Amino acid sequence: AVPPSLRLPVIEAAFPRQLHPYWPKLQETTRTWLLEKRLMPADKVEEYADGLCYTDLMAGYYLGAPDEVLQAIADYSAWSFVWDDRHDRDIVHGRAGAWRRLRGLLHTALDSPGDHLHHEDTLVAGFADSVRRLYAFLPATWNARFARHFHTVIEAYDREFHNRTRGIVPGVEEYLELRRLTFAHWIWTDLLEPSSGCELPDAVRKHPAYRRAALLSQEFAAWYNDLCSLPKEIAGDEVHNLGISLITHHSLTLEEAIGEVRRRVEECITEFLAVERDALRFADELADGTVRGKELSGAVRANVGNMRNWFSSVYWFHHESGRYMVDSWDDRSTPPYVNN
Ligand SMILES: CC[N+](CC)(CC)Cc1ccccc1
Ligand SMILES: [Mg+2]
Ligand SMILES: [Mg+2]
Ligand SMILES: [Mg+2]
């Protein structure tokens, strides 16, 4: 049961949850990876990692992925949560130089991950290990696209560092643009492709129905995170959240902002249902009788199916994960799973 202020009946009724069969092995393998890569202290891994549910989030999303593809994705995803925590702590503690150096190393490791597998910063070496594995599944054209997208993500994190150090809350529209980058919309969208075993040609993945379905899946996920992570973000002096932009720039009360975010999330669902029909019609059109057409049709169908799965995976993750349970913490501003 989800509390009424966060409950989305359409998700519960029309987006049934799915779980990849590799999940039990994935859970342990990513936990071990966090420990062995020294991304979290051993005691925090043992106490918190499984309860954070990072592998459950990916195993409810990339259905049909080969096990080793899912493992690379789950390691990258867990890494990205640890990176969000590092970024937050660098801001809180005023470590502008350490953040700037990490930012530069991530840009370089993204282009040459093999070179960084044994870097002295374990966060950099862990990133490089997951990215090198992701780069082994599809042609180098996909790797170049992943890199282009992630360079843009790193710079969005840098912009968040500057906003928080200056005490600036972005306006609503500025925030919505930024959030497509800090949530890594295009990375999750890129990762659909190794999960279904096919790099999609530009003409296919830029078809308006594919693009719009991909966008709406991510807008839902990011704004639902904003809705559910608002309490811990207020407690932590985080400024990046649609609800915070609405309160700051449109004078909404907390209750009014929650209602507005919820309505925007709900609309993403029914806009997605409409565009999903068009995206699946496009998948049917790709099945032109040829072998390549069958492959592309099947890949698009699998990808759109996972765009749909993201809704339910993200929904349930926010109720299951210890990451958001601010009411349980000794210090609401310092989650117990971060290294402070
Ligand atoms: C902070 C982690 N993340 C990607 C894992 C940003 C890089 C946003 C996110 C939060 C919650 C669910 C899904 C993604
Ligand atoms: Mg965060
Ligand atoms: Mg963040
Ligand atoms: Mg959040």
By DSSP (H or I, 4+ residues per run), the number of helices equals 15
SSE pattern, N- to C-terminal: HHHHHHHHHHHHHHH
N-to-C span: 33 Å
Q: What composes the largest sheet?
A: none
Strand segment tally: 0
**C-alpha Rg, in Å?**
19 Å
Roughly what percent helix?
A: over 70%
β content, as a range?
A: under 5%
Q: How many domain units?
A: 1
Bound molecules: N-benzyl-N,N-diethylethanaminium, magnesium ion
What structural category characterises the helix and strand content?
Answer: mainly alpha
Morphology call: globular
Binding site for Mg(2+) 2: 84, 88
Binding site for Mg(2+) 1: 84, 88
Cofactor: Mg(2+); Mn(2+); Fe(3+)
EC number: 4.2.3.37
Summarize the structure in words.
- With 340 residues, the protein is mainly α.
- It has one domain.
- It is built from 15 helices and no strands.
- Helix 10 (185-196) crosses helix 15 (291-320), helix 12 runs parallel beside helix 15 (291-320) and helix 13 crosses helix 14 (254-286).
- The two termini are 33 Å apart.
- The structure holds N-benzyl-N,N-diethylethanaminium and magnesium ion (3 copies).
- The site of N-benzyl-N,N-diethylethanaminium has 9 residues, from helix 5 and helix 12.
- It is classed as lyase.
- Keywords: Terpene, Terpenoid, Isoprenoid, Terpene cyclase, Terpene synthase, lyase.
- It forms a monomeric assembly.
- F95S epi-Isozizaene Synthase: complex with 3 Mg2+, inorganic pyrophosphate, and benzyl triethyl ammonium cation.
